Ligand SMILES: Nc1nc2c(ncn2[C@@H]2O[C@H](COP(=O)(O)OP(=O)(O)O)[C@@H](O)[C@H]2O)c(=O)[nH]1
């Protein structure tokens with residue numbers, strides 16, 4: 369009785385987002401790609417589940433303030449028009465004051481005979497933190513995966529609609545928060561520091577909350593003004609298309 373699931377969530381996205389999303393995917397189909405596997409890593413409570421639930425369009429993955437449990441990666445697979453998109457929602461990687469290696473390989477296991485196209489690294493925008501337990505996370509990642517991971521990676525900051533209190537210019541605030549994070553990755557995963565500049569990772573901002581508010585065509589927009597879901601897949605898409613090796617060997 370099961371083959372996969374009909375992306376009922378898509379029919380749910382506003383028109384401008386539907387037709388925009390139909391474009392990006394149309395690209396892969398033509399490049400002989402009728403599937404896309406996205407992974408999602410990061411610390412707990414950053415907004416992995418919230419975001420995935422956002423992209424697919426339904427309540428697939430469960431969100432939670434206390435994301436101290438979980439402990440087993442779930443894959444979400446929806447299809448339509450002959451195209452299949454799947455996201456792997458990985459459990460938090462920080463387990464009480466430190467990286468959780470138990471689960472980190474539990475992830476490395478979930479994907480043994482698989483192929484990854486895009487990896488999403490999430491953290492929160494509303495954080496001003498010089499997080500270095502952070503620097504740890506960035507290491508463990510390169511430890512399990514490695515060289516290919518960051519080239520096929522993307523940085524997502526959630527709570528993209530965080531009004532920086534008492535001091536301004538969300539743009540002056542956003543970058544410092546993006547830069548450092550990028551900086552921690554260029555530096556943390558030792559390989560990249562000079563070469564980092566060679567390819568560049570890039571960032572995408574997201575606002576999963578139901579209070580995000582809209583725009584002309586009723587699609588979740590950022591303060592910046594554009595739709596984050598639509599342009600977010602654009603990114604997952606460009607990365608899925610650029611022919612680097614993929615999480616391999
Ligand atoms: N990602 C995200 N979470 C938000 C946002 N606004 C509020 N939240 C809250 O932060 C929590 C994130 O939970 P979840 O995504 O499950 O964390 P995960 O463990 O990384 O998957 C939710 O319970 C939301 O109530 C937002 O813009 N983005």
Ligand SMILES: [Mg+2]
Pocket residue numbers: 416417430435438457458459460
């Ligand atoms: Mg989760």
